[PDB]
From a paper:
We determined the atomic resolution structures of all functional domains (I-III from N- to C-termini) present in the three [name] proteins [name]_ac, SlpX_ac, and [name]_amy.
The arrangement and architecture of [name]_ac and [name]_amy are highly similar.
Numbering used by the authors:
A (entry chain A), B (entry chain B): 32 to 209
Write the structure that this text describes.
Amino acid sequence: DVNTNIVLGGTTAPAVKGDVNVTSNVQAITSPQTTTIDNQTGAVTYSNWDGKVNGTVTATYNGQSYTATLNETAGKENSRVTPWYTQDGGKTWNVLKKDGGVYRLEPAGKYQLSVNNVSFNFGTANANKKNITLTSSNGVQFRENGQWKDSIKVSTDQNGAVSQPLTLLIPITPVDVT
Amino acid sequence: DVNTNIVLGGTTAPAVKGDVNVTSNVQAITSPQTTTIDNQTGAVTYSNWDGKVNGTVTATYNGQSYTATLNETAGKENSRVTPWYTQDGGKTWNVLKKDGGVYRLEPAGKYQLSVNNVSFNFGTANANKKNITLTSSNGVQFRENGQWKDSIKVSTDQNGAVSQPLTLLIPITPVDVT
């Protein structure tokens, strides 16, 4: 697209993009293990939260919908799901240790999932392709050059698989019981 | 190497060995950035600690002393030094984050350093050797099969270098400098 338009930003490249439309279908759910109250009022208190999270990452590309592949082997190359939280406004981000042997995912609060060694099999139909550009539909980020990024370029190998392993950051906002 | 002696606790191989004897020469030192005082008692109070660590890992092998090599490359290959603390003790172990942009280490101690992609150059003289036993003389541990241990077996390549990257855990107990 020709750049015609005089935006005060200083004539940057356009935001027109997207070969592969990566979309998290990851969902998070939590329940309190212990609810308390003072009977002097009706002031309930839900506490001791117990989080769980499930789903997958799909990707629309050339009118076909693919699903991300994880690695179920036990080496350094295990696609390790690691939950991240911020006490700040995302100024920093710390890994959740297991407390009482569960992931305390407290309702609202902001979370992020990190999963390395992801892939996709786009099929022999899509072999040997260069500059496939991955964009997120819903706040998924891709790791590159030591830093998170809104989009990344991948090439497919002779079979149609992304030639090198990805690493994703997935947003999480739990639902709760009640 | 022959079992004569009836110890309680089954009978098991001896622990004595060490083809190559690794020693941490890592030292840690800290100062409070603010020293304060309760004049009604005269009880001083140190706070805002500022830790620094320095040193090397050496190793004795076949009468010669070698020194560990780190990897400088910007990337996934980089020997990442990560400071490491246990809250109270044992099962707890978490990454030490920078506060006030510096690594506060309190002289009460209980810290460990973790460093990947280490190596050694044992010299052309020690090429092509097949199974070498690594031991520490001062509490350095080596990573394998997802867990630390005090010994590992490695082989040298055509040049005399450890064929594969090591990953170490180094103890440190800081000292207070006035």
